[PDB]
Design a protein around this ligand. Sequence first.
Ligand code: FAD
Length: 441
Amino acid sequence: APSILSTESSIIVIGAGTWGCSTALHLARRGYKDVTVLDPHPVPSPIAAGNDINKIMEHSELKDGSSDPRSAAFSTFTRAALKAWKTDPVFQPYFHETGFIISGHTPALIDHIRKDEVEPSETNFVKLETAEDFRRTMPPGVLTGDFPGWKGWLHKSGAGWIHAKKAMISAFNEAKRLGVRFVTGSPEGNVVSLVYEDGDVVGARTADGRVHKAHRTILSAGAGSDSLLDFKKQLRPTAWTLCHIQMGPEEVKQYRNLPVLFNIAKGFFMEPDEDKHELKICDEHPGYCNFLPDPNRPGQEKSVPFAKHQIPLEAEARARDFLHDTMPHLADRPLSFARICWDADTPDRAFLIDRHPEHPSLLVAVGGSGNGAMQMPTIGGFIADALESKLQKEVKDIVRWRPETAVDRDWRATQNRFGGPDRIMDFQQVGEDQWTKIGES
Ligand SMILES: Cc1cc2nc3c(=O)[nH]c(=O)nc-3n(C[C@H](O)[C@H](O)[C@H](O)COP(=O)(O)OP(=O)(O)OC[C@H]3O[C@@H](n4cnc5c(N)ncnc54)[C@H](O)[C@@H]3O)c2cc1C
């Protein structure tokens, strides 16, 4: 069916985000001379989930008998990612191997962590039983709370945080230096449709009415991808919430080299950024969707993203609850920034990276499922491998096109997340006056 693939083949990548920039870089390194990346926004896109001052990176090797094929595939992805965060000149400056603490504050949450995360892992964890145990994982003055009911485990090596925003910019800069062409801005990079001829994809149409033709088209537009192809319910666009506190110029100096602290039913925080000294808190919960009528499925819903630099008041309150337990000296500080951030979950929260069975010139690379950002250095290599029909066996069948898994999908499934109301929430039920008002009157 499709044209024969070579490095002279014209390629279009839809979406210059986390995975799109990685893909552009890897295709350039592999000697693909004719690559064009389309995005409605210039890098770093304000709607990219990767456009964040930090994200968590973690890699765990799994014991024999404690893996299933899905978790083994995940460890294959993170193994490669870890190696590259420590080595690849484009990414290495942006990885901080400070460690990672996973915790919960009820016996049920703590048991879940023990069974799913700790017992299966070859990692040698340090157990944290008391408030003092938690506080001693960071410099004096940083963790001050009583951690009521908390127990957790510290993973020192092979985990930490990444400066996702700077690493994405780094990848973009290097892909463009190596000759990739970026068309970024609206309407010129805002893709509204895939373009088909003879039952295959021949490129993309942007909002200005231009048709961009290529021999292969890669769809890597994060949550926005769901509007450009019928994924047969394989994607659920879903939002999480983040806010920032501005640290002062003396107090900030203690907050350095910090392991990530994560309570699976409350949230996490990462150390203040180097440029604005802003400390980011994510309140953990199963996610917000924005459920509107599915234009192609009568009587059914489909979640549609929208951008906003505020968060619901209830999400701010959850963030402050996390701070009260951990850093109560910060819990009443004004927010300096907040936003909603969109990803898309597959039914099993494995990635979806495959050639389309009906349209072989289309490659989809979607379904970050809440753990795509840590894949940045290497995900473009896996995506390029799939383009070249050689995605490795340890991942190919896990991340395949799999519409059978999403028949009668329950959009309100909590998909192994916890916190907040312990249910999927709907932005259509959030009042207009129910948001933070940062920077307003
Ligand atoms: C709050 C939050 C915290 C997270 N924490 C972590 C973490 O700690 N570690 C981790 O690994 N992952 C984390 N994730 C998940 C991670 O951010 C995502 O899985 C990953 O960034 C997704 O990458 P992507 O390239 O698929 O999407 P994105 O990075 O969102 O990029 C998508 C791009 O597509 C572009 N686009 C959209 N519409 C179109 C269109 N019509 N035409 C062309 N281009 C388009 C966008 O402008 C954007 O640049 C988190 C996500 C959220 C929301």
